Design a protein around this ligand. Structure first.
Ligand SMILES: *Cc1c(COP(=O)(O)O)cnc(C)c1O
Ligand SMILES: *Cc1c(COP(=O)(O)O)cnc(C)c1O
Lengths: 750, 746
């Protein structure tokens, strides 16, 4: 349910394995001995989260017993304890002794006060020596992934010189109890690890492949280690890793099964010291980097949209990774800790993926890099660009669009749209100084051309954009807001809904306002293009524009033969609970732009969809009547495959549980009860809520709130007096509800 | 040379998660299912290739398939021809065969022929005696084979045979070193054959199966089916679930454990699973050909391409690209016998192109990992590793002795506009404050309106192409440099050219006067050394060095547009080395990411930065895009920057001087310069261009070069070949030879 805090003061490593029977428990045992036996407050925390084959086999007990033996051999006293916390029923009967689980009281503890401490813990145990996923259901005893991660998070905090080993169960891709592959299960924590390879044969292959399936889940591996079989397996391994990761070779394990193994551990102390130090150096080097990243960023970056004179080192957020909707954020100020923070600005409104879907995309992207890299677009065809165009045409552009034009970002797509619109215009009306018509407050990107479509303001003065001119007729939009339980309208200095759905309703078009609008609008340098930001003015302050007003404006502009541009860079692809705002405005454009969420938040890519007619206006025999706009990476396979995936994933009820019965809409994500309350709060002007967006309007008092929300594990950037939480199309309502609860609690604390 | 693989008939690799999984049993089952049929078509053929084979001759998968099919032919009562060949083996292998003998070719063959019957054709290409790893056997038995030799051998076998099905059985796991030490999966990559994966029913087998699959996927391969042997663990359920049932998982019954069992009845018990597996791979090929065969047409109906007049493009000129491997497109043609073939990307895809096959594969993982670790992570006031690493590499290389700040954008166009805004500030602060830039007519700086304003009026700026253009600059005409008939000459409007001594010379004074002799000019913007889009004209560096010094003397900010030249395009990391002067502002993109993904930087001086400092959040630089500093591009550029730069990874970097070596053959160059149709040749770094004296004549040449496996887009009368920073001179030489040959044929 909630965000984790992982202490980073002490190193904690996963013990991964290419397969089973490679030595994994032997490796934990060697690390521990190397660390506990030297010449006080020294502690090795050994966790075997999942354990099958219990109780006849028990890696906790193995480590436990083997260290007791080594402590005598090496003549260095230590304390030791082994615990097992839970097991299925059949496991607990084997010892003599819910979700189908049993708690246990099982502990051994040969204590020796003041001596280095060994602390072994098995968290959950089953009986059959099979994959955890089979045991879970055969013994009708299971554990949820988050429960497993909470259990471990609890153990870590409970203990934090110090070292922690978390031993996996099976290969890197073995299903855990719930069927979730082991490598996806531990991903939220993103712990560094070591991989126990295979010295055998086919072992080079199995080792490289396990390593790759880890890498491609975002993990770091401090060392690969394996058991000598006389094949010199280490040479191809070291070469593949370009010797950036050390490969350690343990001597052959005795084959005689009655072997205590004591002398082998002694023979191997060298390799185990080396392995222990590598994971000690690796952590130290990682902390030194983390601890210097804020400062160095302040000296080396020039950030967009930030007045550097004002940013002080303490406000530079250090992000170490992301897992779905959560940043993993480093704080030195704590006990040096990585913790989760919900990305509530959705990172410049790009954000979409689930943890599940993030992992999926990563492979889809790896594969696309390896198959295509970047491949020249003009006059060419390759699969991911073709697939993407087909998905765009058959969804977002279903009943109007017939051509797809690729660019790099929202800004380029918009400029491409402006050029197309002015042609369909200078061809129907034969052609001249051209201006657009827009709604003051709409935002359309930062390149000069997209800048000209925005109304004069401070952001357009001579200092911010020297070549600005303001090439448009900017009308002031009526807006819609939610206050004290009901949706109102707020007309411009010129000029109560039951529910939010009434607003978007077709019957509303025959009403009074529709006439009042048609006149005020009709009543208005040649206007050669209509450009709107459908339903919502994003950058402008999360104002919901009256859809009726824009539906009417569109129909007017088309009646007078003016091309209509829908700027859906912000709204497109489930941001607002639909694939296209076309569905909400009830009218179609001639031109439309998409980006941001098009790639599901992973990589830049922009499309400008066009009508068959808009296209024809660029047809002729002169290569000069063509559209001469293009960038080097236009239609890059990377972004295209990524968009082709995201489009289908966001859309499919199988993969996106937020998708409804009808397939055309997201279920309501933000709690109705809370939404009322936050809007009826003596500090809120208005609330705008729809799809994945929740915003409110109230200076300082807002920056107070943010400081407070950061404390709750919610990162968010304010739009002046507008505070917004924005999730992804796949984010669960339970997550959103928690967001609103935290906002509401902090909101009363003034 | 470039390969041509027939695609008329399906050819699949047989990959394995490990060894001892059944691999040879799977080939054997496919072949039986395919050869033993009711049609008994005389022209039915299964080509079985075991390219690499160790443990020879006591074990021999060719012989296994061979013998086991003979057996099944009797059992199933359907006659067939069969033959087993071994083409090469180490010495120790050949002695084991008696043959009274560091590779050598054997005549060894057995061929129980039965005319008119379905044909089995088994071929082992290279064999080692020792039952050890191929990379170990190769050196222990002083007998090796180059990767390209192995691929040529296979290409030769395929052409020699192409109803029909072809199985190529791997040796070991997907990542087992081949004879040369190259991992098996990287070895077959250039061919990019589809395949099936033989998984592991055992235990740890789900893990090993997923991981083998993933190391395949992450080398760009497609897998039609996963198949494995039942061990009672129901391994197939997690597998099917991970693949979201988009790839079928087939489960064979347990193989008999008794070692003397001839397995005949198991193959019979398994015919169901083997039919299924044979159909899946026959259908995956059919579905792949249907797609391929409809891509050009559909592209014509669905795309709106940049820079192309659609009325003129016909279906027949739409190039179908199926993949790329380093510098080579793999291009589909139905006009052939439906064939995938290699074409050198000589336009470097809009001048973005860099990676080696080796480096392409490397970047792919680097990117997979970055997607999985970061996705996209909010930039302003934040820090994450790949962006920090990238900025450090930029500052310490490309901006070493002048730059102190790095600003991220999406492409060249956005970087340039960002640069323009920065320059006008350092200007409107030194001179206290209508602003125009000063540029060289012909320089190109991107297609967004602001970058458009820095380009001199032309047809591409008329009211139809850009309605809001204005031409906000003073455009001077550049002196150029060309190579003609063996010598470099100047055209007023090779090491000697870039030399510092040349600055004290005549021209330097003549230049200093004309430029000094020239609405407020508030920024200098050049495309250093080469005007790319403009026609691959080399601008006299002395002329630009002088212009820069002139503009700095009058307190005008200098912008270097290095989006095209940056990062080894022209044989150096920065044209700063070549011009011998430093900017205040510079833009990078295209090759910055090593040709993989968009990303742009605008490097700035400490001073240019300071002009945006104050207490008002309005004096800040208010330009930014949603994906600014995306971890994807950043990690990718952080890699590329180091890889292109390092003699260890880039063999074109000369080991002692740590610069790029010369790539374009001396002779062939003069020969094209001497040619009479050629006006000029410009050559430097990874670039070779020429202008003809007559554009039909250029389009004629391209048609002809495509025929030679060289794809390239013309700049009117300028024809250019452009390789990557890592491309071998041997490859380049071949390019020049083909251009020269076609150049005489007029
Ligand atoms: C973000 C946005 C753009 C521009 O996108 P970038 O990729 O940041 O240039 C244009 N229009 C709208 C409505 C947007 O939200
Ligand atoms: C390609 C290029 C640009 C612009 O790059 P895009 O990413 O295509 O916008 C700017 N200047 C020069 C010299 C270039 O070559």
């Amino acid at each position: 349910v909630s965000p984790f805090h992982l202490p980073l003061n002490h190193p904690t490593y996963l013990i991964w394995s290419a397969n089973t029977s490679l030595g994994k428990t032997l490796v934990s045992t060697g690390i521990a001995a190397s660390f506990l036996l030297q010449q006080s407050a020294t502690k090795l925390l050994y966790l075997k989260p999942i354990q099958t084959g219990f109780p006849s086999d028990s890696d906790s007990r193995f480590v436990f017993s083997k260290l007791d033996s080594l402590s005598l051999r090496r003549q260095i006293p230590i304390s030791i304890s082994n615990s097992v916390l839970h097991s299925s029923l059949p496991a607990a009967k084997s010892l003599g002794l819910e979700s189908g689980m049993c708690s246990l009281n099982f502990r051994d503890e040969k204590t020796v006060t003041g001596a280095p401490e060994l602390l072994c813990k098995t968290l959950y145990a089953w009986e059959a020596a099979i994959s955890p996923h089979l045991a879970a259901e055969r013994e009708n005893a299971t554990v949820e992934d988050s429960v497993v991660l909470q259990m471990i998070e609890k153990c870590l905090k409970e203990e934090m010189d110090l070292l922690c080993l978390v031993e996996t169960a099976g290969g890197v891709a073995s299903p855990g109890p719930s069927g979730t592959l082991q490598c996806d299960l531990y991903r939220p924590f993103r712990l560094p690890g070591i991989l126990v390879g295979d010295g055998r044969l086919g072992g080079i292959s199995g080792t490289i492949a396990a390593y790759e399936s880890l890498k491609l889940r975002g993990y770091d591996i401090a060392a690969v280690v394996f058991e000598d079989h006389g094949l010199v397996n280490e040479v191809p391994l070291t070469s593949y890793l370009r010797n950036k990761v050390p490969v350690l070779v343990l001597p052959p394990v005795p084959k005689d099964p009655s072997d205590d193994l004591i002398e082998w551990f002694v023979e191997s102390d060298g390799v185990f010291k080396a392995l222990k130090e590598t994971m000690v150096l690796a952590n130290l080097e990682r902390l030194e980097r983390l601890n210097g990243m804020a400062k160095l960023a302040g000296e080396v970056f020039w950030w967009p949209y930030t007045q550097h004179k004002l940013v002080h080192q303490e406000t530079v957020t250090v992000i170490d990774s992301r897992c779905g909707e959560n940043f993993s954020i480093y704080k030195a100020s704590d006990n040096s800790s990585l913790s989760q923070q919900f990305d509530a600005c959705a990172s410049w409104w790009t954000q979409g993926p689930d943890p599940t879907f993030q992992a999926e995309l990563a492979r889809e992207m790896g594969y696309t890099a390896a198959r295509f890299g970047h491949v020249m677009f003009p006059e060419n065809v390759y699969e991911p660009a073709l697939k993407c165009a087909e998905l765009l045409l058959d969804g977002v552009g279903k009943g109007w669009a017939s051509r797809v034009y690729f660019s790099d970002n929202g800004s380029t797509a918009i400029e491409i749209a402006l050029k197309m619109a002015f042609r369909k215009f200078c061809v129907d009306h034969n052609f001249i100084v051209v201006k657009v018509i827009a709604l003051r407050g709409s935002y359309h990107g930062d390149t000069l051309g997209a800048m000209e479509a925005q109304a004069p303001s401070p952001y357009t003065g001579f200092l911010q954009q020297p070549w600005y001119t303001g090439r448009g007729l900017f009308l002031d939009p009526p807006t819609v807001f939610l206050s004290n339980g009901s949706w109102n309208i707020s007309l411009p200095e010129s000029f109560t809904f039951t529910s939010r759905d009434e607003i978007f309703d077709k019957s509303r078009d025959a009403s009074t306002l529709a006439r009042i609008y048609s006149a005020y609008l009709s009543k208005h340098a040649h206007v050669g293009a209509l450009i709107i930001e459908p339903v919502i003015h994003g950058a402008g302050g999360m104002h919901m524009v009256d859809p009726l007003f824009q539906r009417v404006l569109v129909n007017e502009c088309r009646n007078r033969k003016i091309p209509v541009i829908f700027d859906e860079v912000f709204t497109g692809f489930w941001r607002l609970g639909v694939e296209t705002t076309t569905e909400l405005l009830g009218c179609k454009p001639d031109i439309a732009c998409f980006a941001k969420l098009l790639t599901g938040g992973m990589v830049p890519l922009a499309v400008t969809l066009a009508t068959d007619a808009v296209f024809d206006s660029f047809s002729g025999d002169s290569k000069l009547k063509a559209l001469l706009h293009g960038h080097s990476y236009s239609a890059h396979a990377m972004g295209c495959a990524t968009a082709a995936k995201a489009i289908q994933w966001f859309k499919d009820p199988e993969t996106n549980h937020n998708i409804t019965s009808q397939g055309k809409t997201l279920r309501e994500l933000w709690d109705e009860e809370l939404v009322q309350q936050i809007s009826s709060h003596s500090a809120v002007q208005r609330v705008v809520v729809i799809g994945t967006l929740f915003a409110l309007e109230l200076s300082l008092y807002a920056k107070s709130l943010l400081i407070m929300l950061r404390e709750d594990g919610i990162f968010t950037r304010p739009l002046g007096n507008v505070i917004y939480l924005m999730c992804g199309p796949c984010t669960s309502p339970e997550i959103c509800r928690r967001l609103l609860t935290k906002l509401y609690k902090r909101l009363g604390e003034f």
